[PDB]
Design a protein around this ligand. Structure first.
Ligand SMILES: NC[C@@H](O)c1ccc(Cl)cc1
Length: 330
């Protein structure tokens, strides 16, 4: 089997991407944030505290003939940005872009933190990291990808995120028309539960490439590119007027600036992030100070190849027995 679904930026900055997901019988379609940095599939629901729901589409398991309460199971998750959610668990039929999983754990939110409430466009998350990170207790549950894997033509999914445009998540096949050149594959460590890999270095604009190992995770659920302070300093030093602002919480730059590109290494191959991708616009409405898309990872404990980096590439998440990551230009 295969599946193919369009993923769409939630706003004009590409802060996140939503992908339609069918849950239950008859189908209830929710727009979920596909997150390769977590492993829970959770949704706003009929059980979510009413004061904490504001515009989202909710899953109502009582209206699904295939929904079954997973007796005694609860979940609770906190994300890197400080947001959180928790609730109980059903199993139900879940389809993504024509690919169907029966008996998928669908985690129903009883509580969500303010940032989820405030974002009307995201109805939940669909986690695509390794199932070892799943938070369901007392019996840990498998991701959608893990459940689908054996049925897929090939045990892979791919992320093809757009810049200020729709993109695609495919399951079970590699679309050879979606990228240019060849895909370069690189080794993955699963020891922390993430798609963790090692970039071979970087360049700033037309600068010379610096060979240096950068350990990081491929995370579709993180907006920006978070890299070591040395690297980030070297990038923003090439932008006149750029500075790290403790009050704003990172690097800002004059909105009148032209940003250089940023290249990262995948083995001997190179992915170029155009400078426009690194512009996240005014720090506040009407400001002439703009927020940078490349930020320091200091105090995270790991580097994060988030959407800024990933949307510059066609990315293969290979879930074979020995997982690997593939990157191609597009
Ligand atoms: N995208 C999931 C989010 O909780 C996350 C996961 C891992 C890191 Cl290092 C940062 C943020």
């Amino acid at each position: 089997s295969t599946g193919s679904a369009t993923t769409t930026p939630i706003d004009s900055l590409d802060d996140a991407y939503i992908t339609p997901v069918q849950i239950g019988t008859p189908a209830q379609t929710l727009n979920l944030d596909f997150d390769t940095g977590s492993s829970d599939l959770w949704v706003f629901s009929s059980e979510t505290t009413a004061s904490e729901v504001d515009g989202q589409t909710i899953y109502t398991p009582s209206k699904s003939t295939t929904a079954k309460l997973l007796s005694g199971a609860t979940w609770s998750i906190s994300y890197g940005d400080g947001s959180s959610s928790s609730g109980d668990v059903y199993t139900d039929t879940v389809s993504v872009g024509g690919l169907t999983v029966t008996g998928q754990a669908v985690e129903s939110a009883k509580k969500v933190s303010s940032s989820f409430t405030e974002d009307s466009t995201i109805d939940g998350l669909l986690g695509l990291a390794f199932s070892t990170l799943n938070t369901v207790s007392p019996t840990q549950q498998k991701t959608f990808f893990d459940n689908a894997k054996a049925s897929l033509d090939s045990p892979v999914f791919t992320a093809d995120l757009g810049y200020h445009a729709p993109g695609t998540y495919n399951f079970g096949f590699i679309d050879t028309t979606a990228y240019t050149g060849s895909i370069t594959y690189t080794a993955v460590s699963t020891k922390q539960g993430f798609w963790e890999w090692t970039s071979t270095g970087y360049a700033v604009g037309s600068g010379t490439f610096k060979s240096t190992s950068i350990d990081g995770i491929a995370d579709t659920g993180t907006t920006l590119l978070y890299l070591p302070a040395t690297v980030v300093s070297a990038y923003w030093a090439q932008v006149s007027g750029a500075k790290s602002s403790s009050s704003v919480g990172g690097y800002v730059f004059p909105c009148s600036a032209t940003l250089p590109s940023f290249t990262f290494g995948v083995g001997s191959a190179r992915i170029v992030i155009p400078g426009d991708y690194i512009d996240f616009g005014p720090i506040s409405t009407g400001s002439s100070s703009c927020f940078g898309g490349i930020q320091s990872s200091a105090g995270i404990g790991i580097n994060i190849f988030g959407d800024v980096a990933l949307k510059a590439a066609f990315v293969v998440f290979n879930g074979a027995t020995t997982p690997t990551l593939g990157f191609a230009s597009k």
